[PDB]
Amino acid sequence: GFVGLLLPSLNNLHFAQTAQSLTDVLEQGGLQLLLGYTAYSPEREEQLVETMLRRRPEAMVLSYDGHTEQTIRLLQRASIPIVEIWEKPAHPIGHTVGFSNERAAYDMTNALLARGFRKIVFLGEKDDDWTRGAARRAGFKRAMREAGLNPDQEIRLGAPPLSIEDGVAAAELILQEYPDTDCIFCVSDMPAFGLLSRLKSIGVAVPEQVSVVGFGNFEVSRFASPEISTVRVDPIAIGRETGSLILRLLDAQHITLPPVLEFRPSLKNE
Amino acid sequence: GFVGLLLPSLNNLHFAQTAQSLTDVLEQGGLQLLLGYTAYSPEREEQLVETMLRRRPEAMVLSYDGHTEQTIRLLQRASIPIVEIWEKPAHPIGHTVGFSNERAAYDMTNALLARGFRKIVFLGEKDDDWTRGAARRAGFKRAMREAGLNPDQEIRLGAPPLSIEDGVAAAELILQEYPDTDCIFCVSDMPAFGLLSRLKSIGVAVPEQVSVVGFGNFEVSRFASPEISTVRVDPIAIGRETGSLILRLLDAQHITLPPVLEFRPSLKNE
């Protein structure tokens, strides 16, 4: 029959590649994917879960960005494999395939501190409770706190998922709040690209005055000028591991795909 | 009940916005949206149509890029509203919501000719029979043919959908085959952005040496430097009109949302 997949975005390279590889693997066990689009609404996620569960999916896969209490209960009670992907939640319902978003941002922030950056500012989302962006902010804050530096050194705007346009809006805001910033670490590559576009427009040198770092290795990071330093992930592997896990189970596991820090010319001295 | 939506991409702003507005309208009417991901494959589309129809959706919405004969038969024999979106097919099964891709590309090409560009090259896909990209090529060719110009001024690579990375690879193919080109009209903004990135890398001035024009008003077109001239579409309206049509039918129509040409600094004199 089918496996359900819930996603918060239909405009995301990672989820597209995850779905493609997951599709390919499941086709080998005779299964199709049925998708639900939540648009970041935990309430809509709940409604979609209830609807799908009624149709008796063989497994459920959810891209993690927080759940309602009732969603957790419905999934726990379903007696089928549950897989949460793209994050290691504090309290996994069943299996997970992904990595710690908190740890990834902590590691990147530490790499930037090690490279001698003196005034790093995090750019993230408003109204992002329980999402992957909130975990990234948390990892940044932990790194700054451990370094004796200022964890409040951050700007929040928009909503999940921060856009290129939001990055454009953030440029002046960051420079207003932290004029001496030498590095901006963004919640993903999308606002990083917008930030880069606006800094170039206003004549701020990147990276000579301000360095720019994103997250995700989305396409824009590789084709921007300069190319944007980022945290590289493996969406094909996430889809394949998730598919393989499901087929094994139907013939709790926590499977880690370690991110890679990708330093490119948008970071000074790289 | 639910409505089924089949889409070829999970990395596409248009389809994301369509799904979001379609979701909003349907939810207000008590219906949910469930998705099938085709990955531009007519064979996967057929397999998804066959299983989804058996789950008894209230209506089926198909993002149009051509169908197998079997898919057509399955949809013809259904006694539920069928809506093909994002293109006006030559032979619609039921209802449509979208616009003529052929006419849109013909219109843009004519606008370029009116602006004095002569050596326009279309950048498009291989293995794209029956898809929206093929329609765009046809519109470009008709414009060139009617103007008494050479319609065989084009480069084909990759597969639907042409990517940013494909645009990068196209730069050298185009300049090798057509060294005198003054304007490249790409099948969408995505290869246009890649093309722009590569031309900037190698030192070809846009628009002074070569102008670049895309299709779809994707986010990169608005924040690239220079901003990318494009064909602006209305995905919110497409999703809204599709949802509203379905609810009216449940209580043939051809709903037309004419695109708008957007001229930006990637076009000489704009």
Residue ranges of the domains in chain A?
1-99+233-258, 100-232+259-270
Residue type, B105: A
Distance of CA A249 to the CA centre of its chain: 27
Query: Cβ distance A66 to A128 under 8 Å?
Result: no
Tokens representing B101 are 């891709």
Contact B125, B191 (CB under 8 A): no
In the structure encoding, which two tokens stand for residue B12, read together?
A: 């596409």
Q: Using the 8-state DSSP alphabet, how is residue B56 labeled?
A: -
- Cα-trace Rg, chain B: 19
Helix (H) or strand (E) run with residue B155 in it: strand B154-157
Nearest alpha carbon to residue A128 among A169, A165, A160: A160
* B249 interfaces chain A, CB cutoff of 8 Å: no
Query: Can you tell me the distance from the alpha carbon of B78 to that of B58, in angstroms, rounded to the nearest whole number?
Result: 11
Q: How far, in Å, CA of B228 to CA of B234, rounded? A: 17
Distance separating alpha carbons of residues A17 and A235, to the nearest angstrom: 6
Determine phi and psi for B267, rounding to 5 degrees.
Answer: -105, 130
Rounded Cα–Cα distance for residues B13 and B30 (Å) = 25
Tokens of B114: 């009116």
Cβ neighbours of A9 in B, within 8 Å: 16
Assign A260 to helix, strand or coil: strand
Which residue, chain included where needed, has tokens 């370094």? Answer: A147
How far is residue A116's CA from residue A110's CA, in Å, rounded to a whole number? 10
B85, B97 in Cβ contact below 8 A?
yes
CA dist B176 and A80 (Å) reads 57
Reduced to 3 states, what is the DSSP secondary structure of residue A27? helix
Question: Which one-letter amino acid corresponds to residue A168?
Answer: V
Chain B residues lying within 8 Å of A203, measured CB to CB: none
Does B41 contact A at CB distance below 8 Å?
A: no
As beta bridge partners, residue B32 has B2
CATH 3.40.50.2300 for domain A100-232+259-270, yes or no, is: yes
Sign (positive/negative) of CA torsion A35, A36, A38, A42?
Answer: negative
The two structure tokens encoding residue A243: 């598919």
**Whole-angstrom distance, CA of residue B89 vs CA of residue A261:** 46
> Can B1-99+233-258 and B100-232+259-270 be said to share one CATH topology?
yes
Longest dimension (CA), chain A: 59
Q: How far apart are CA B139 and CA B145, in angstroms?
A: 10
Closest CA to A38 of A170, A119, A100, A130: A130
Residue that the structure tokens 């790499």 belong to = A111
Contacts of A47 (CB under 8 A, 6+ apart): B32
Q: Phi first, then psi: give them for residue A231, nearest 5 degrees.
A: -110, 115
CA-nearest of A61, A56, A58 to A86 is A61
Ramachandran region, residue A30 (left: φ > 0; alpha: ψ -120 to 50; beta: rest): left
Nearest to A37 among B19, B163, B219 (CB): B19
Q: What is the helix (H) or strand (E) element at residue B156, kind and residue range? A: strand B154-157
What is the SS3 assignment for B96-142?
Answer: EEECCHHHHHHHHHHHHHHCCCCCEEEEEECCCCCCHHHHHHHHHHH
Joined together, the tokens standing for residue B90 give 């030559």
CA dist A144 and A106 (Å) reads 9
Helix, strand, or coil here: A134?
Answer: helix
Residue with tokens 């408003």, as numbered in its chain: A126
CA geometry: angle A37, A42, A48, nearest 5 deg: 45
Does any CB of chain A come closer than 8 Å to the CB of residue B7?
A: yes
Name residue A181's amino acid.
T
Contacts of A15 in chain B (CB under 8 A): 10-11
Residue A89 contacts residue A64 (beta carbons within 8 Å): yes
Segments of chain A assigned E as strands = 2-7, 32-37, 59-63, 82-85, 95-98, 120-125, 154-157, 183-186, 211-213, 230-232, 254-256, 260-262
Residues of A in contact with B13 (CB under 8 A): 11
- Which of A23, A24, A37, A47 to mutate to probe the B interface, most B CBs <10 Å? A37
Structure tokens at B14: 């248009």
Establish if A204 touches chain B: CB-CB under 8 angstroms.
Answer: no
In this complex, is the C-beta atom of A15 within 8 Å of any C-beta atom belonging to chain B?
Answer: yes
Query: Looking at the DSSP assignment, which residues form a beta bridge with residue B61?
Result: B5, B83
Other CB atoms within a 10 A radius of the CB of residue B237 amount to 15
Q: Is A19 on the interface with B (CB under 8 A)?
A: yes
Q: Which tokens hold the place of A4? A: 């359900």
**Where do the DSSP E strands lie in B180-244?**
183-186, 211-213, 230-232
* Structure letter (DSSP) for residue A212: E
β-partners of residue A61 are A5, A83
* Identity of the residue numbered B186: C
Distance separating alpha carbons of residues A184 and A176, to the nearest angstrom = 13
Report how far Cα A203 is from the mean position of its chain's Cα atoms: 30
Alpha carbons A224 and B223: distance in angstroms, whole number: 11
Fold annotation for B1-99+233-258: Rossmann fold (3.40.50)
**Best of B3, B6, B11 to disrupt the A interface by mutation (most A CBs within 10 Å)?**
B11
And the tokens for B83? 């809506």
Does the beta carbon of B253 lie under 8 angstroms from any beta carbon of chain A? no
Q: Where are the beta strands (DSSP E) in A64-200?
A: 82-85, 95-98, 120-125, 154-157, 183-186
Report the alpha-carbon angle B234-B232-B255, nearest 5.
Answer: 40
